[PDB]
Amino acid sequence: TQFGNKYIQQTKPLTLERTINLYPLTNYTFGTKEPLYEKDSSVAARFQRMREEFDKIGMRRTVEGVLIVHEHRLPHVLLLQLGTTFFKLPGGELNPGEDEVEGLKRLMTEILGRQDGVLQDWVIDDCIGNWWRPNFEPPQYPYIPAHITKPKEHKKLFLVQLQEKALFAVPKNYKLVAAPLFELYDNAPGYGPIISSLPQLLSRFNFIYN
Amino acid sequence: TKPLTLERTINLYPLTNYTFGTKEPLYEKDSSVAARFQRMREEFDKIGMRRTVEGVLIVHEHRLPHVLLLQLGTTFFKLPGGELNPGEDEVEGLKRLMTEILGRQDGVLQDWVIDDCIGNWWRPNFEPPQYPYIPAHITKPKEHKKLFLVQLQEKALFAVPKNYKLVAAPLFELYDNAPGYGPIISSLPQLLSRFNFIYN
RNA sequence: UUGUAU
């Protein structure tokens, strides 16, 4: 309208400047819930299950959420530690035909969703990267390698935007840590290729401290 | 349908769609590493933090993304880009730089399509180290580098200064190869993984 | 520490 106030919006397109709110770690409350044990009792049991499942429902589709907070204006990724030395992002396997984002909201709620009844919604608007697994082996890559026509798994990473305050419940078998970016950066020996390239995957975001 | 924040579709075209001529050499303002950091200090005191922008132009070959790199010698590769002028707009500046380095000289309008930021790197000191985040307690970074995805038109003519060679590097060549390309180019594969690339 | 460019 030319007969009224102009409500000024961010000028650059969201493709060019994507602004994201980070709140302090101390804004969040953490509790404990029942342990979530893995579907696989060992490595062998797991690439075996991965082969079997591949034959009768196709390529495995995984989604994972990157949750970010800050401490004195420095971004930290929330990582689940499966006992000493092993870290994973929240997320997991999509059901057949399941929407990626609906699937990740499902999985975020299972792993970290509060128990006390206060409903906790997840804001998931951004894809931050993609990883493919060309064989039934541990190795993954941020592209589909040459001559790979039937990748065995496809993993999609998403930025999960947190509310100003929230309560999370951590399954008993896990510890939650907040890893600063300098800790992840150039540290594949500590976190693997996927987690340790998060700093890079996060660098395009214009973070707001609060 | 899907927010361009959730899904970003980009059209790639074959390398052969593009033809590469040459023009007169375009020499860097600094002739050595030593002079580069010397000039970084002057301009720092004078006009403040260096604002640098660079362009990632992608093509495909048999359905695999290749990034175009300017090879200055047998061991050094750079992305099209450069230093912004004080106050100058980032995308406007980047367009200016891409035309200097790669713009055809046959009078034809070359319009660069720059819609997407793909990363940021900061240089805390007047030394080589760059990080994809402002490191802890660095209040005054000396350089801020910003990377953009440039969507190429369907066919184009580019003119490469006789002192550079343009190359198309497949992602598997860049990935896990900081030793060959540095920390910035060698992580373009990760930075590019989010895009849904259409082959044509 | 991808760096001098015949």
CSV table of C-alpha atoms in Angstrom, one decimal, chain B residues 95-96 98-100 102-113 151-159:
chain,number,residue,atom,x,y,z
B,95,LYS,CA,30.6,-9.3,-11.1
B,96,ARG,CA,33.2,-6.6,-11.8
B,98,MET,CA,34.6,-11.9,-13.0
B,99,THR,CA,34.5,-9.7,-16.1
B,100,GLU,CA,38.0,-8.5,-15.7
B,102,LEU,CA,37.1,-14.0,-17.6
B,103,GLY,CA,34.9,-11.6,-19.5
B,104,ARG,CA,34.8,-11.9,-23.3
B,105,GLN,CA,36.2,-8.8,-25.1
B,106,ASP,CA,33.9,-8.9,-28.2
B,107,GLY,CA,31.6,-6.2,-26.8
B,108,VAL,CA,29.0,-8.8,-25.9
B,109,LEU,CA,27.1,-8.3,-22.6
B,110,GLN,CA,28.1,-11.0,-20.2
B,111,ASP,CA,25.6,-11.1,-17.3
B,112,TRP,CA,26.6,-13.1,-14.2
B,113,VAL,CA,24.0,-14.7,-12.2
B,151,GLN,CA,25.0,-19.9,-12.2
B,152,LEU,CA,26.3,-20.1,-15.7
B,153,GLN,CA,24.0,-19.5,-18.7
B,154,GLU,CA,23.4,-22.4,-21.1
B,155,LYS,CA,26.3,-21.5,-23.4
B,156,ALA,CA,29.0,-18.9,-23.0
B,157,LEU,CA,32.3,-17.5,-24.3
B,158,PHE,CA,35.0,-16.8,-21.8
B,159,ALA,CA,38.4,-15.1,-22.3
